[PDB]
């Protein structure tokens, strides 16, 4: 689906809208795109550097700035602000798929 499709919710509530399988899948795809695409004014990918360094310290914490995601994809920011548990459950898998692109064995230890 599209971001404009996610702008208009078919369900009455946000809780069962994100819970829907196709909506969850396209939200996961958009979050993976957010981690892959985003870059700073300098030009380096801040999220790639964060993933590389958290793999370096073997730590499982990812620091995602909300302002970056708001200025990149605002509908996901509203979705995360209003229904945090369901968005964070998907975005955990998104972050693991992002860090799987560099370290295949990282899913084995953590």
Partner 1 sequence: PKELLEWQTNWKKIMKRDSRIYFDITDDVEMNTYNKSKMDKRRDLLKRGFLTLGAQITQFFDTTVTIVITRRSVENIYLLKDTDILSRAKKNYMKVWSYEKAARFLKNLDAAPTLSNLLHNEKLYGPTDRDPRTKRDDIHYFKYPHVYLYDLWQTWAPIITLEWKPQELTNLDELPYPILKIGSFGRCPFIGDRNYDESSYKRVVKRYSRDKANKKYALQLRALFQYHADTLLNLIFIPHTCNDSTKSFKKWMQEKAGLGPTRASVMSKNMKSLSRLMVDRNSGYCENCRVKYESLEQHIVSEKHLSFAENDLNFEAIDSLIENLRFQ
Based on CB atoms, which residue is closest to partner 1, 18 or 27?
27
- Shortest Cβ 30–partner 1 spacing (Å): 7
- Cβ atoms of 47 and 35 within 8 Å: the answer is yes
d(C-alpha 110, C-alpha 103), whole Å: 12
User: In angstroms, what is the C-alpha Rg of the chain?
Assistant: 14
| d(C-alpha 73, C-alpha 8), whole Å | 14
Shorter beta-carbon distance to partner 1: residue 49 or 81: 49
Q: Which of 9, 20, 48, 96 binds partner 1 (CB under 8 A)?
A: 48
Question: Does residue number 39 form part of the binding site for partner 1 (CB under 8 A)?
Answer: yes
Question: Which residues of this protein are in contact with partner 1, per CB under 8 A?
Answer: 1-2, 5, 22, 25, 29-30, 32-33, 36-39, 42-45, 47-48, 71-72, 101-102
């Amino acid at each position: 689906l599209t971001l404009e499709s996610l702008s208009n919710v078919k369900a009455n509530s946000y809780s069962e809208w994100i819970t829907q399988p196709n909506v969850s899948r396209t939200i996961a795809r958009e979050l993976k795109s957010f981690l892959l695409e985003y870059t700073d004014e300098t030009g380096r990918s801040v999220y790639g550097a964060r993933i590389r360094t958290l793999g370096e310290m073997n730590s499982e914490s990812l620091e995602v700035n909300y302002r970056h995601l708001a200025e990149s994809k605002a509908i996901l920011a509203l979705f995360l602000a209003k229904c945090p548990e369901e968005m964070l459950k998907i975005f955990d898998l998104v972050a693991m798929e992002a860090t799987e692109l560099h370290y295949p064995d990282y899913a084995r230890i953590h």
